Symmetry: C3
């Protein structure tokens, strides 16, 4: 079951990295 | 051990879904 | 393999609090 855990955390890392970008983007638009 | 992590990632999935909605609302107002 | 998953999940949860703060900050500014 460590395979499902690893694929979920890969998805969450990409989520986090994309949210990080949108936070940095949104910071410059205010 | 595997149960503890599962409940933590399922928490992470709900968290990330929630921040994504908030960002989506920040972008519309921005 | 297992300890790295647990460590990465800790690292995600901590960054989600960090992002929660950043998002709430922007939430004011728009
Ligand atoms: Mg999976
Ligand atoms: Na921008
Ligand atoms: Na932008
Ligand atoms: Na276990
Ligand atoms: Na069970
Ligand atoms: Na999901
Ligand atoms: Na390790």
């Amino acid at each position: 079951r460590m395979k499902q855990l690893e694929d979920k955390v890969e998805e969450l890392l990409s989520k986090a990295y994309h949210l990080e970008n949108e936070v940095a983007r949104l910071k410059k638009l205010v």
